[PDB]
Amino acid sequence: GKYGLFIKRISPKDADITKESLETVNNMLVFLAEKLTKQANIIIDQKTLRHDAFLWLLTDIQGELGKHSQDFANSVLYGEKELVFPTKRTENLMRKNTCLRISQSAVKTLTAILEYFCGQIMEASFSQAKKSKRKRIRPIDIEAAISQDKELHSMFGKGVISGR
Amino acid sequence: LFIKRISTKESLETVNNMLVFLAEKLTKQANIIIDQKTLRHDAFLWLLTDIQGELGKHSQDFANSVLYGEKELVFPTKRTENLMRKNTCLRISQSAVKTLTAILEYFCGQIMEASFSQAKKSKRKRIRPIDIEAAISQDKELHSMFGKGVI
Amino acid sequence: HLADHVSVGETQIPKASTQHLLRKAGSLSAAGDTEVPIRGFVHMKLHKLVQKSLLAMQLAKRKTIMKSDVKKAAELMHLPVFAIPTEVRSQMKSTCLIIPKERFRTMAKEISKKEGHDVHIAEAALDMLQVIVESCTVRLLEKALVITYSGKRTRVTSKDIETAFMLEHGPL
Amino acid sequence: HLADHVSVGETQIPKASTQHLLRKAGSLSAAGDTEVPIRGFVHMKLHKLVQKSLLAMQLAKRKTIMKSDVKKAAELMHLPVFAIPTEVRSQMKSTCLIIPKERFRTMAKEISKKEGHDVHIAEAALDMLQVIVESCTVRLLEKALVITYSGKRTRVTSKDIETAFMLE
DNA sequence: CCTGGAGACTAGGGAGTAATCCCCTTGGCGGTTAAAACGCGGGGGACAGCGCGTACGTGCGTTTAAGCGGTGCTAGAGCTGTCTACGACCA
DNA sequence: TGGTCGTAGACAGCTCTAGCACCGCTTAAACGCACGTACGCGCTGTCCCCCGCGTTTTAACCGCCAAGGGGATTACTCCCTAGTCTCCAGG
């Protein structure tokens, strides 16, 4: 689950990031994946998982951001876009949290949504840093940024971060 | 379904539902807390050794007595097996099922006597949901344990 | 805030029902505007629950919800429930439920229509819905009553329940 | 009430920690008695966490708490930990640990001895305990602060803090 | 030069599909009643306003204990080969 | 009740490393004491908006009642996926 290389690859906003922050966001994404897959397990009524199930599970998320996410999912599935995170590691962590059957389409959708949330978190961090000028994205750039956005905190919040 | 034998269809449904919920939650906790590939009765035994008050001490003492002795054990082992196997992809043993049956029947006895006391305080010789609501609200430790639920 | 949640053009809970709910909370008196915040709160909770239930219904390639869908949504809120379909002081013993049944059915039908789904609803799903919603609203109202007593005051105001909502949840 | 929870004999959290915590939570200045309830709260929270930690300990028959142990303890309580082992503006930027460190190792040793298990402890577990306890206490103080504003009062009080804790 | 991963198949078991009959909902009609809504002193809780001392914000000295290593150490956390012993799956 | 069958978690032995305990030093914060005052407390004297009461529409609800529709059931097909395989090209 060490996705740090892909984080830098998908982050074109330079501003050399603290080594701690890569681990923090790695924990952030893996926790998101775990909660959302336990979600998928508890919502399904059939033995085999389906991509449309994940689509709907993200659809109820408040705001047009969910429709943007599913648009990106369609784009990566068939439209125009590709992925950068490995499929195999995601499949392993998938199997680690279920005793059911999963197809590749769900894997593609999950990778897409990970792309999307990683993009929003990195851009929000960079925007907060620009508000505070300087460079070299710091831990402080996460807190009061996730807290800055209403919807992110309203759906993530809770989680303890370094200090406060 | 055998709570009536232990001792109002609706109240039997409520007690069965709350018992199975408690069993499910405890099984989930035990599954997530352990790090070794299989679990033993000692895990649930320690899970008993966190309930403040002498009541937890009686709970663990009765579990130990059932393991060493026999007590009553009128509960279907197959039903318990189904209940945790439905929500566990791990390894188990018969000591664990015996312990969980003992603890669940002990809780059933406590809630039954609490309901009886609450009904007698209200001068009623029958079992009704309002009485069990008053009983579960009245006791501090049961309210702490069961506050999450609603009925 | 909470008042903005309600809008003109939809059905509303009867005011007397609100008053009975506040009395059931044990409050001896209330301000004249308390109906609006609780109307908004119950509408919001029902909206969230019905949306989640609709998602569950859609997942099963179904066309009408059952008790299974509602219980799955209930387990989804991390909120356990033990239900199966199968003057003021002298009132808490009453188990009779407050909100009229057909009003709540009309609310459900409207909120489903706004989602573009003319989906039938079974009475067991109803029972579960109003029991869970009354549970949440009574818990919130009790917390509000406590915070009002803490304020060294004897009544309740809209700002009080606004504060109570602010404490329990996070922002907005 | 948390007043009964605090006893005599164990180590004492210095008051300056209390005023610093209130400043971090955004309050103006502390009252003459607020130290006792907050100290009781932190003591009881650390008690619960270390007790669950020993619950984890007894499973593997080991005798040193590792980061795995503390993370299991944190998650079983449903707390998403994100830390890794690896005048309000005057401290808003600062995010260092606001409490002395040796005090809590002393507390951990004493509570473990009280339970009856003299057990060695690693620093990573200490850091995790630090972050979880600071988060919980700052949350509780913020709740109390918004309550005491809600009472049309510009000050904190022991009544306010205890009713805030009860409101949970 | 490794290694995990790019194809290959391949069968089964669940996934997808069609029919059906009736139970369970759904809409409607009617009676009326319990309830929901509209006035009314009032008076009692709320609030504007006045007054204070005292609990407390801020400032000053001082210690003593907390932090930064410094070091010897050991104990005890991992790592690595048995085996018997306790479930699982069968009669 | 017994057969066996298996695999796996205690068990013992090694090892090396990381907490641990003490040392010591140093210096920076905790605390206790003074001072002067801001405000929560406390009180007071008027206020106006719920709160019981009362009277007066209405539509929730229940009961029936027809009806229909899609849902749990059964039967049928099929293709998708894990799941083993395999050897081999990219890393």
Residue D87 lies in a domain: yes
**Beta carbons of D92 and D61 less than 8 angstroms apart:** no
Query: What tokens does C41 get?
Result: 């709160």
Q: What is the largest CA-CA distance in chain C?
A: 55
Q: Which helix (H) or strand (E) holds D65?
A: strand D64-65
Phi, psi (5° rounding) for residue A24?
A: -60, -45
Residue C6 lies in a domain: no
Residue A35 lies in a domain: yes
Nearest to B150 among C81, C86, C95 (CB): C81
**Beta carbons of A10 and A115 less than 8 angstroms apart:** yes
A45 touching chain C per CB within 8 A: yes
Chain D partners within 8 Å of A163 (Cβ): 95-96, 131, 134
**Beta carbons of C108 and C121 less than 8 angstroms apart:** yes
> What are D81's strand-pairing partners?
A160
**Dihedral angle at the C-alpha atoms of B57, B62, B65, B70, nearest 10 degrees?**
180
| Residue among B89, B79, B141 at smallest CA distance from B110 | B141
Residue D3 lies in a domain: no
Pairing of strands D120-121, D64-65: parallel
For strand F, list residues 97-156 of chain C whose Cβ lies within 7 Å of it.
100-103, 120, 155
**Dihedral angle at the C-alpha atoms of A117, A120, A125, A130, nearest 10 degrees?**
170
Helices D123-150, D158-167: crossing angle, 10 deg rounding: 110
A132 touching chain D per CB within 8 A: no
CATH number of the domain bearing residue B129: 1.10.20.10
Q: What domain range is D113 assigned to?
A: 15-167
| Distance separating alpha carbons of residues B65 and B70, to the nearest angstrom | 7
| Distance separating alpha carbons of residues D50 and D41, to the nearest angstrom | 14
For residue D61, count CB atoms less than 10 angstroms from its CB and return exposed for 0-12, middle for 13-18, buried for 19 or more.
Answer: exposed
Residue C138 lies in a domain: yes
B148 touching chain D per CB within 8 A: no
The residues, ordered by sequence, that sit 6+ positions from A144 with a Cβ below 8 Å of its Cβ are: A128
Q: Which nucleotide is nearest to B38 (CA to C1')?
A: F9
Query: What tokens does D79 get?
Result: 């707390």
Residue D122 lies in a domain: yes
Q: What is the DSSP letter of A79?
A: I
Alpha helices in C60-122 (DSSP H): 67-76, 101-113
Proximity of residue A104 CB to strand E below 7 A: no
CATH number of the domain bearing residue D132: 1.10.20.10
Number of domains in chain C: 1
| Residue among A38, A30, A34, A28 at smallest CA distance from A1 | A30
| Distance separating alpha carbons of residues C23 and B3, to the nearest angstrom | 37
| Distance separating alpha carbons of residues C100 and C21, to the nearest angstrom | 13
Proximity of residue C63 CB to strand F below 7 A: yes
**DSSP letters spanning C110-162:** HHHHTTT---B--HHHHHHHHHHHHHHHHHHHHHHHHHHHHTT-SS--HHHHH
Residue B70 lies in a domain: yes
Residue D150 lies in a domain: yes
| Determination technique for this entry | cryo-EM
Proximity of residue D29 CB to strand E below 7 A: yes
Residue A162 lies in a domain: no
**Beta carbons of B113 and C45 less than 8 angstroms apart:** no
**Dihedral angle at the C-alpha atoms of A20, A25, A26, A31, nearest 10 degrees?**
130
Q: What domain range is A105 assigned to?
A: 9-155
How many A/D residue pairs have CB atoms within 8 Å?
41
C96 touching chain B per CB within 8 A: no
**Beta carbons of B135 and B114 less than 8 angstroms apart:** yes
The reply to whether residue C81 touches residue B151, judged by beta carbons under 8 angstroms, is yes
Helices D35-60, D67-76: crossing angle, 10 deg rounding: 120
| Residue among C31, C150, B146 at smallest CA distance from D143 | C150
| Distance separating alpha carbons of residues A121 and A24, to the nearest angstrom | 12
The reply to whether residue C82 touches residue B9, judged by beta carbons under 8 angstroms, is no
How many B/D residue pairs have CB atoms within 8 Å?
25
Q: Which residue has the tokens 């600071």?
A: D134
| Residue among D167, A154, D149, D27 at smallest CA distance from C159 | D149
Q: Which helix (H) or strand (E) holds D131?
A: helix D123-150
Number of domains in chain A: 1
Proximity of residue D150 CB to strand F below 7 A: no
Q: What is the DSSP letter of C64?
A: B
Total Cβ atoms within 10 A of residue D148: 22
Chain B partners within 8 Å of D75 (Cβ): 32
Proximity of residue B93 CB to strand E below 7 A: yes
